[model samples]
Target chain A: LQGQVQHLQAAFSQYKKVELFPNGQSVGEKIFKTAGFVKPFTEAQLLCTQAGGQLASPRSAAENAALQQLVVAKNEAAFLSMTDSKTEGKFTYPTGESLVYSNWAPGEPNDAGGSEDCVEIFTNGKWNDVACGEKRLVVCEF
Target chain B: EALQGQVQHLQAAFSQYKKVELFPNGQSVGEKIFKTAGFVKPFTEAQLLCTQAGGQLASPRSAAENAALQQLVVAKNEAAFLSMTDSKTEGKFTYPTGESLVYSNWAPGEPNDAGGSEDCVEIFTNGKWNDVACGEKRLVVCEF
Candidate 1:
């Protein structure tokens, strides 16, 4: 009760973050239940769960593997959309200078009113203005 | 008494000398003060020659700078004259349009002959004579 509860838990209970390489394909966050803690770890996991395609957290290694597979599908979709003019790329974040952009989500690049004209490109190949803090897929040249 | 007379005479001579005019005519200072003597002609061959020995082109910083340009002028003039009098080059000079063509206009009677030797045009500017072939070389004013 005196010290913070975070240290009272066993070492295995501490959160672990892992980032795989090449294209940085990995699950966002993993949770496991081992020792005494207030919150019971349901072991929820999300795989390539970019906004809108919210698949909760991955429960096991197999779930993580499934997320990796989802990443490949997303990469292919992004590639196809970028190469084809009819298919527009996703608008992940808004730029301070939105007027310069050729593609704007609806009235987006709308300056939102004063400045924040951030955009997010959804898996559907359409763009929509969204807040900067929102986590979304980002595709750029290697 | 004669010595005394000689002394008196010497005194008289001195007095006369003082009274006499320093300059006889009083009209002009013979060598220096004359109006014509003060008339300084423009740059002459002497001026140019001295410059050529060490003179440079318009952009010269030292005498050496002008020397090369002077030689260029000499060659250009020579070529111009060679081209002018010779029938082979009837109308040829490197001068571009609108550029001033300088010529050393000789004394009236000079260059009176039209032979190949006299075919070049000479201008007396800056106090020197320059003979340029009628066909080649562009004319340039040193200061102009």
Candidate 2:
């Protein structure tokens, strides 16, 4: 049926390139492809792991900007692996790496009402802290 | 000859299952898993239609049940009325026949009691529920 055909086409179009990463001391095989779906932070984390990576974590300004453009091109914002749940006002990547490059939007990271803890990338390449439970598009990276 | 025979078998199987699969306890129509119907009417009229069809305005009792109902709406690609409402007491939704809304999927910041009159619930194709004015003639779903 036309509906089944459309569903198949949609799935194929959303398929992303597989990304391989290097281990601490050696090269690793293709881990997983970029996942294209919206989910809560916890679900996104699990999905990225299933896809062979973690929620995306930009290590520098250039990388952050590039990731932002990628998300904007997809016409949606996405959850990054940055959060301050461990220690308020001290956000870090999922791997526990301290944020080396920051691109907080104006008046953001306000920890609004002290409930916001997760980070998301805006279309403009800026970041905002939000509740981790909120569902959003995910960007996974090696 | 083999290919031709296989094609005929597939076509025959498709024909038998294309419309529905009836069970002793329920029926499956297309991608819809069980008893259901749809119509355009106000809440009361819609409820009457459901009863006429030997069912009630669809009342999903749990998350899985809600998802199943949503799947049907998504396949149909439109909004359908549900039997849950807060009309009796604002902000407290209950089913038409005293069933509890054990599960809910309100759209973001929804059920706002907007203008103090939004009480009826409608499920959109996105599977999210929204509070709308009850008098609006909308498509309703029934579950037997």
Candidate 3:
């Protein structure tokens, strides 16, 4: 087990360099990655899961500001970690807990066209619920 | 299966950048997250700022923890506050909770209480501690 931990350590060091490095970085208690690509909700979720993290959303203003730093740097709106597919209008994390923070734009999350279940955060750190299949920027937290 | 499970357990830890020797992208060692305030502040202000940020002033208890703080201090090129004070008793520096320090890294001639007013401790880039005035301004680094 000890040897395996060491082996995995080496592998993760290399992984950080490529998958989450240079630009993907740590802030506060979490590490976030913006690998520079657009992915649909499901595709991005799988990508982050395989990489040992998951889709990230800000639970606090600080977290929002941190992710916005990357979002504005990329000049795009990125996927956040809340979905209402399980029950529309009831945003919850993948781990099945309801989101406790609200930074939604006024008159937003209207579930426009009735297919909007995923969340995309603007550069201003306000959230807008959008369709899950729309190809958008990916951000992951570990 | 158990051995492989162990590997997977650690793999999960690494996923969150935990249980590692260092952070490749920033200041961290293992599970602790150390963040520099990016500017200097007095000892009291540093403690309050860290508290408001949901962490405590950087109080390194282990060798790696101290090393991690040193990484930030070195980058700032100045000593930063460590969460200790000798105010409770002269030369008996303790953490905020008043417990005695089990591991100390004081520099030579430290805890001098020069002019009879030194109480707080700051850590240099060399990973050594020095007792200085609480009102003196120094870099701030907090640990979460």
Candidate 4:
């Protein structure tokens, strides 16, 4: 099993846990981490910023796939930085960047309950609209 | 203990035969057996074919396992069915053995749950996995 351990260590070397969160990415690219505990969308954003990054804003399909691969095993709904908090129907990244690519699940962003404004990444790299107050894992990237 | 030791010894002696017969070019790794299905078939049919061979649909669990399957498929220049599927629940994939999918090399925006019908999984020659309808025909690999 030495070989397996080494292989796993190599695959996960890019991840550096901060505050007990699980993290992943390729070596030397931007690092992405999953929160160990669930938190509100606003609190998740703060935690990511405190960790030297922001809630991940995957602007490309490849980025979304990689991020999904990182945390898909958790099977937990996790928050991304995209939100429609400013304008009820307009979503943008925390940095004010307009979404260029999207991987929303079928019939998603329904704004379910009329208060779902924040975005989340499911295990399948599909996005969903949920209430900002809902507690879920946070996906942070630097 | 002596019989067990002898069994292991005989297994080691006969192991090379197993590799030669089932896994051409020494492609077997651990419990995974690699072989080209050599024909296109739908997911359920492929699963049955694998079972008839004394194995089941191939379940690649890690980068290494994926890479090995990738190599086999690349050598043959064909796509193959894998055991991953999100059929039971959308976006929540699992192997045929009920193991949660923890490792993947998915093509971009894959498992889109497109049309809310793409539930089965397949591997591409580009070494990435993608979700597709279960009825689509494709070659497959099996794991014993």
Candidate 5:
């Protein structure tokens, strides 16, 4: 069973650099956004593109402010987002790409076509179609 | 008549300059400068000002309307300035007893001309400095 049905992956960026792990690999992590995942920072949102790749999450505002501190020390470990959430294989995608419904629930990536091809998780336990024209959430970490 | 107008203009300029002065909370300029050397300008200011202000500034979006501000500018612009304060005449910048702007931020011996004459506060974001009119726009971020 070496498939995506249950697994975790890690990525890197200009914020945090670490071995990312899912909250848990049980049946629960697959349901909640915060379930098997670590958030960017307190009172903040995660920023990523539609294609879904490495995303950085800041743990605190202080950490968010020190974003350049990461670049300064030239620490190559900082990553804004990770590829492992509760999902099988998904990552925070940076902007500039065509959204394809390869993993959508049948014609899902149809928000606006060209740029409107990103996934947004809601506190209500459901995902939504968001236009890339909009500013998505950004997660900061220290 | 022209001489009188020049004096009045000078007076107005002086008055405006006095408005945007800022002072650190008794921290050494060297310490602040040392820490700020490699930090991003916005983040550096945020760290210093936050430390001095005895509180932290809101994440990137709180102080300045990055999203809203961007909408007001041409997309082609790599960087743009937005007012951190409403009145350019009311902004204030002051260096306390031991504080000094004598660091890299200043070309050297800056604030030497001190007083209301130095009303403008320069903000560096996205790798460039945008000298803003103090009172006209709200400061996007603050530093110690």
Candidate 6:
């Protein structure tokens, strides 16, 4: 069934091109979108990558601000794709690469309660250390 | 039986894919999804913007579709140009594809040719149409 598997894979990819996908605002070459739902950190990462995107992680001040506006409509925080779970002092993206840009609220990443290993972004675009088990809105970058 | 197993695996992956939403800025109605371009441009440029993205300037063919597109326009709190015009012959509105409209939501006394140059159609936040000049700026919306 190897040939059959390949057929399904191609069909799946083509199905992805249709309108069942959410609409997004294009920024640079990346399009940022939201699923209108929330999931815990790991789940957010799973959903995004499965759909050919990643948990929304901005690469610059401009990107963060634009992504921030998407959250403003919900007026709540969302899980971004960075974590220090691997090393407390060194935060990296879901792919394990070091972060090139972050907008931390002053005194953030406190790792308060010693359990906050994930990062969540506030409506103002500031980052704060959060618990990986905490559910937050899902935004994706494709 | 093992082939059925492969089929099941395929079904699972495809079902999971359906759970993922791709566009947050678009609203789906029937067979169409209307999405905003997130910026304003004149009528001529607006159509091109949608095309550049592989869609077209939104043309609502029914009240239901117009109301759906209206939700996006209302959310943006701005008027957007529709893909219809009377530029060729005043009062004979047609879509860019040359199809005559079967439904319209025009405002009273509108297409009134207010400026003596009102040829393009705009849908206000109120979901009612008012003819405006093509050069006037409006938020761009695309049908996907």
lDDT of 3 by residue, B1-144 (tens): 767776677778776654242343246667566777567889988897666555678888888889888888888797899898988788898887889897878899886899999999999989999999999999977776
Each candidate's DockQ score against the native complex? Answer: 0.00, 0.01, 0.11, 0.01, 0.01, 0.06
Candidate scoring better on DockQ of 5 and 6 = 6
lDDT score, residue B108, model 6?
A: 91
DockQ of 6: 0.06
TM-score of 1: 0.16
True contacts kept of 2: 0.00
For all predicted structures, in order, the TM-scores are: 0.16, 0.39, 0.46, 0.45, 0.21, 0.51
Q: How badly does each model clash, as a count of residue pairs?
A: 33, 0, 0, 0, 58, 4
Using TM-score as the measure, name the better of candidate 2 and candidate 4: 4
How high is the CA lDDT of each candidate model? 0.28, 0.67, 0.80, 0.73, 0.29, 0.80
Best by DockQ: 3
Write one digit per residue (lDDT tens) for candidate 3, span A33-105: 8867889999999998999989886788778887877787578889987999988899999888998786899
Ten-residue segment with the worst summed lDDT in candidate 1 chain B?
Answer: B30-39
Q: Write the per-residue lDDT of candidate 5 for residues A64-96, one digit (tens) a residue.
A: 333323322332222333222333233343342
Alpha-carbon shift of residue A98 in model 6 (angstroms)? 21
Candidate 6 lDDT for residue B46: 86
* Chain A TM value for model 3: 0.83
Clash pairs for candidate 2: none
* Model 2 ranges with Cα > 4 A deviation: A1-34, B1-144
Which TM-score value belongs to model 5?
Answer: 0.21
Comparing 1 and 6 on TM-score, the stronger one: 6
